[PDB]
């Protein structure tokens, strides 16, 4: 029954193997509280400021539900740039120093990488990064790792297929970052060659002793795997190489014909939203875990709000 | 003290004479709870997800106030299409399966007819239709019928003038649908000939034994009526027929000179917002019931939230 | 323990010397409630409708936090013009008469001057003006005067520099209005000649016996002053007179070199947001009171919500 060791929750590089495992146990407690028929009061009298610079329905409501299930209450904007309707302009650090006067914890989604760290360094109240523009999405990585542990029973000695746009994929890079803190983890990188995982992750996995292999055969890798983690491939990542897009039509898709060839105890994960890269008919299969994934988000974020505001 | 018989509240064709009368009694209880000076706890620990695809201030706040007066709490978006700011696209069924993880009941206003039914069929939690685009607006019909019963004392043996754009009028069609489940109901259809009520409603009233009559004399019908239910007539419904618009200038208007000729116990109803089709000076008359109409909305929706979440 | 004497909070000309001093004492109580570790229940079961016609993050959250810290709850729109997504148009008085059915107090920010008074005159529930377009911003004036009293210990016998666009400056005019209700107040008007304070304020101060002096030397006035109240000067207020803009570059700026020359017990005030007219390095100085200003906003508005809803 002590202080949470992190002052703020900003970057994947803040969490070790022990910290993670300890947070996952808290999230299992959080799930018990959510399941209960009496309203929790753990965060009674605490207010959360949801500072979003852009609408992001799913993750905003995830955090706001999380606060409410613990007894706390929310302030919300998805128009953080509009600080006053009558006097134009907005400074991140000015917004933080104004809003911390109104609230006990800020959950921020800025448009610009590096914003979450500046907020943390400016605020006298805890800050959680909900999406630092195209940079760190820490709570999404933690809820990916939690779902795996949740659905598989272990993180040590697992095989995980990361599929789709790996070059530009923010959640596959930080999932891959976090898994490498466990033992006997094998990672498959399943993508067309031109959206293939970047070297900074390849050479960090190799420094971590994580085994890693590349493929463009999804069928082949799906059969050997605990976890198929799926992301779309936007057409625009192909540029003028339509021949390569036409080569890639059909092959990086989770559909019935890929469920056919998978272990019965494997899962399909997908941070959502999805385009056509998982057909609707995969939903009926108890191995489609992407909606249970989203639900783990509520627990993980209950956990984080709880550690940051009242401690272990 | 049993389960509410409807799993979801989607379409007018779900409610019979008995169900309605039973819901109206609950809404009279709900009004007592709202009038009380202690905060109700009936829905303590329940969360409502207000999933609106477009801003709709009045009906959104109506439902959100309703939840709060019963002790419950709200999640709210009027930007449901924007599921993530970083990964584009949104699937109705995916949105429902994500958000039901965060909430206990969804109140949805989609842009497309048929959306409310799909949500109900996808969700493992009750769903209320707040506006299925240009289709069913069930809670608005129920609050129209409730106001009539509320202000008139009876639904059996009443005369109700439905006035304005009847061809394209969603609330006049479903008001008319619902009234036909009562006895000795006479309906007047008061409109220019080119926005005159469509045949599917005319031939269902005639199958229900509801007496119905058409007119373009508002003055004439107002004098024989319990209820004048008023809707605007957008100029654009006239197309190139401006001669017909100029013919219609002044005659489909509730003003002092129409109050002059009405029973003292008749009421002016109007789902709002209004353009110029009810002059401001009608507001002072105790027969203008359109604001008491809006207030009945709060009760009816308290009722629905209450039946759906904790039963009769 | 009596009724609050104001039915609504709309205009600076509603508050005398006694009323202000009494409100400031309440706001000091409100600060004690906010500092407490148990959740206040003073406004339990009261709902506030935040009716904003335009996003205005800082003042909206200020009021909403205020309601929550007292135990009350909020309804919120920053899209008040959009009354229904399906039937276009909105009438201020219709919006008020609909929304008062859902709520116990309305906090309104309209786009048009005179809107707050009409709302007050239409509503059967208290109304607070959060910003009547380019007209009265009463709670901002009250939180300016409160900060001065809060940070200086007195309002009688003080010197206050009002700096920036005084011609067009809404908060400097109403700050200046309110200060003139105290004794031995000297006001400096520090600006370029073409955005110099207007005659209606100059001749009311002179009718109040308030001493007032104009300058374009900030350095000179800063040294003699309790309070430097700073506002930006938009380039566009110069029109084609760029020569005058180039003359004004650098001289109406609060930076270290102006802190150097000020009393140790003087304060920098600025309603925010700020452009470049206060360098970031002024923030470290304990005399920069603009963030403590914003925090006083929470107290003052707690006070107002409390007087209006449950009395002294
Ligand atoms: O096909 C997809 C869908 C989502 N995402 C990632 O998942 C995140 C989901 O978190 P949020 O945007 O909903 O907060 C997005 O930010 C984005 O990085 C992908 O990489 N690919
Ligand atoms: O002059 C009017 C005003 C409103 N409505 C109807 O009333 C509904 C009010 O419900 P809401 O849009 O406020 O939810 C609208 O959707 C629309 O069908 C009309 O038919 N005519
Ligand atoms: O440089 C500035 C910043 C703000 N304001 C005033 O301060 C108010 C702050 O209140 P709000 O717009 O945040 O409610 C604005 O409305 C505006 O009148 C200025 O005059 N100058």
Numbering used by the authors:
A (entry chain A), B (entry chain A), C (entry chain A): 79 to 390
Show sentences the authors wrote.
However, much remains unknown in plants about the unique organization, regulation, and localization of the enzymes required for de novo biosynthesis of pyrimidines, which are potential targets for crop improvement and weed control. This metabolic pathway starts in the chloroplast, where aspartate transcarbamoylase (ATC) catalyzes the condensation of carbamoyl aspartate from aspartate (Asp) and carbamoyl phosphate (CP)1,3. In general, ATCs consist of a catalytic homotrimer with three active sites in between the subunits that can be allosterically regulated by association with other proteins. Each subunit folds into two subdomains of similar size: an N-domain (aa 82–221 and 374–390) occupying the center of the trimer and holding the binding site for CP, and a C-domain (aa 222–373) bearing the Asp binding site.
To further test the role of the CP-loop, we replaced F161 with Ala (F161A). The mutation did not affect the solubility nor the oligomeric state of the protein, but changed the susceptibility of the enzyme to UMP, PALA, or to high concentrations of the substrates. In contrast, parallel assays with F161A proved that although the catalytic activity is highly similar to the WT (Vmax = 115.0 ± 14.62 nmol min−1 µg−1, K0.5CP = 0.62 ± 0.13 mM, K0.5Asp = 3.20 ± 1.03 mM), the enzyme is not inhibited by UMP and also becomes more sensitive to the presence of PALA. ITC analysis failed to detect the binding of UMP to F161A, supporting the loss of inhibition by the nucleotide. It seems likely that removal of the F161 side chain destabilizes the inhibited conformation of the CP-loop, reducing the affinity for UMP, and thus, favoring the alternate CP- or PALA-bound conformation. To better understand the effect of the mutation, we determined the structure of F161A with UMP. In apparent contradiction with the activity and ITC results, the structure showed a molecule of UMP in the active site, the CP-loop in the inhibited conformation, and the missing F161 side chain being replaced by a glycerol molecule. It is probable that the low-affinity binding of the nucleotide to the active site of the mutated protein is favored by the higher concentrations of nucleotide (5 mM) and protein (135 µM) used in the crystallization condition compared to those in the ITC experiments (70 µM UMP at most and 30-40 µM protein). Indeed, a single point mutation in the CP-loop, F161A, is sufficient to turn atATC insensitive to UMP without affecting the catalytic efficiency of the enzyme nor its inhibition by PALA.
